[PDB]
Amino acid sequence: DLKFVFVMARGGDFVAGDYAGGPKIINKEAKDSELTEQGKQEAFQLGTKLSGLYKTKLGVSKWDSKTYWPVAISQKRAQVSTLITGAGLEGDQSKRDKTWTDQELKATSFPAMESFSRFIKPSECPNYLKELLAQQGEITTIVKECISSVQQVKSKYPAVDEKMPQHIWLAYETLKKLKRQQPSSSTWMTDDLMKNLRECSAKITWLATTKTDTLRKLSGGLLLNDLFNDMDQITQGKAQPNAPGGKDSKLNVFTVSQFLVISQLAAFMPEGSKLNNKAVTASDIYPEDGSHVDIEMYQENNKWSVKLVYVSGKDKQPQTITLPGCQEKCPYEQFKSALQKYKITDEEHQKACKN
Ligand SMILES: CCCCCC/C=C\CCCCCCCC(=O)O
Ligand SMILES: NCCc1c[nH]c2ccc(O)cc12
């Protein structure tokens, strides 16, 4: 009945570090960060959660290299996270604390993976940045709500450039981990200061992926394109493309940084979409730590449909996305048609990034 599930999950918590493209706050690079002990447990819990949600519905008798496919973006902390989530599926306690080989870490890739990061890579997609800066009117109005807090942050960390919209978002996420992990030293980030920065971050990132057709295509179009490439085979009884386990592989788990959850949510919420039968606000949909998007494919006799379930963070209840004009279980061809507008192929995306 349930035949196949895609999961994309934000990676487990890692030692607070600066983002590439972010301001220098920690003076250590997040790309060098270990998962925290909490982050390893969170990643493992996700796999235990997913097994309980889906193992028996998918007809899987044993989670192993044939039955699930753990993938991740090209960052150690995301790759470690995805493999630990796999350990949770398998119920392999000791692999949670494994020091995964460089080899086991690289073996979490798939062909379209790196293209998913093109739109935020410096110099690689200038048209995406032109189109984000074109929304400066709305950005200024949003930032006007938190500019006092940004000024206090910049007072302590002068590298934060309020003129760079991503610096406000990336400073908030950096400070959020720092407050969690070192609370004694973080008493200056009060509840009101962080909640204020969080609102700015939510509104900026949601604007950056949904305000215009070009922002939606460039940030999320390749996600749709690869998903449909896969579902065109699954819906014919064939294996997910490139899945190591072939037809045996019933679950794909993709561990990412926050920006790809945001982009994936945006790609699944064209105008008129609902989350639990209500319009969404930027603040409510902002994917926190522990967030994941679940893409469930159903088959009733010969009829395939797709259901989209979103968990916005740790301990948050799942909510179901409904596309405009479709049901919770949206028949496959209608679902794909509903999402054609902002889908884009790799060849098209490279041209659209540069033209
Ligand atoms: C979530 C959509 C992006 C919002 C605006 C970003 C603007 C310009 C791109 C530069 C920022 C680099 C992001 C790095 C994020 C990461 O690696 O986790
Ligand atoms: N090949 C499918 C890549 C991909 C795109 N979006 C996804 C969401 C979840 C997932 O497991 C995977 C994906």
Q: Which of 184, 209, 234 is the last residue of a domain?
A: 209
Q: Phi and psi (nearest 5°) for 156? A: -85, -25
CATH number of the CATH domain containing 46? 3.40.50.1240
Residue 257 Cα to ligand 1 midpoint, Å, equals 10
Q: Which of 175, 209, 243 is the last residue of a domain?
A: 209
Instruction: Locate the ligand 2 atom nearest the alpha carbon of residue 241 and give its number.
Output: 1
Number of domains composing the chain: 2
Experimental structure resolution, Å: 1.8
**Claim to verify: residue 193 and residue 300 sit in the same structural domain:** no
**Claim to verify: residue 108 and residue 130 sit in the same structural domain:** no
**Claim to verify: residue 137 and residue 265 sit in the same structural domain:** no
**Claim to verify: residue 175 and residue 88 sit in the same structural domain:** no
**Claim to verify: residue 90 and residue 24 sit in the same structural domain:** yes
According to DSSP, the β-strands at 251-256 and 68-72 are parallel
Q: Write out the residue range of the structural domain in which residue 54 sits.
A: 2-119+220-352
**Claim to verify: residue 191 and residue 262 sit in the same structural domain:** no
Distance in angstroms (rounded) separating the CA atoms of residues 104 and 13: 20
Check if 296 has its Cβ closer than 6 Å to any atom of ligand 2.
Answer: no
Is residue 200 included in any domain, yes or no? yes
Place of tokens 């972010």: 22
Q: Residues 262, 47, 176, 256: is their CA dihedral positive or negative?
A: negative
Smallest-distance ligand from the CA of 256? 1
Is residue 9 included in any domain, yes or no? yes
**Claim to verify: residue 178 and residue 235 sit in the same structural domain:** no
**Claim to verify: residue 105 and residue 72 sit in the same structural domain:** yes
Residue 215 Cα to ligand 2 midpoint, Å, equals 19
Please give the full DSSP string across 307-329, using - where no structure is assigned: EEEEE-STTPPPEEEE-TT--SS
Of all protein residues, the one whose alpha carbon is nearest to atom 7 of ligand 1 is 166
**Claim to verify: residue 150 and residue 57 sit in the same structural domain:** no
Residue 320 bridge partners (DSSP): 309
Is residue 33 included in any domain, yes or no? yes
Residue of 79, 81, 68 lying closest to 109 (CA atoms) = 79
**Claim to verify: residue 199 and residue 245 sit in the same structural domain:** no
**Claim to verify: residue 324 and residue 194 sit in the same structural domain:** no
Distance in angstroms (rounded) separating the CA atoms of residues 59 and 188: 51
Is residue 245 included in any domain, yes or no? yes
Is residue 214 included in any domain, yes or no? no
Distance in angstroms (rounded) separating the CA atoms of residues 13 and 311: 16
Is residue 135 included in any domain, yes or no? yes
Of all protein residues, the one whose alpha carbon is nearest to atom 12 of ligand 1 is 21
Please give the full DSSP string across 138-205, using - where no structure is assigned: HHHHHHTTTHHHHHHHHHH-TT--TTSHHHHHHHHHHHHHHHHH-GGGGTTS-HHHHHHHHHHHHHHH
Residue of 299, 306, 298, 292 lying closest to 334 (CA atoms) = 306
Is residue 49 included in any domain, yes or no? yes
Q: Which of 176, 209, 242 is the last residue of a domain?
A: 209
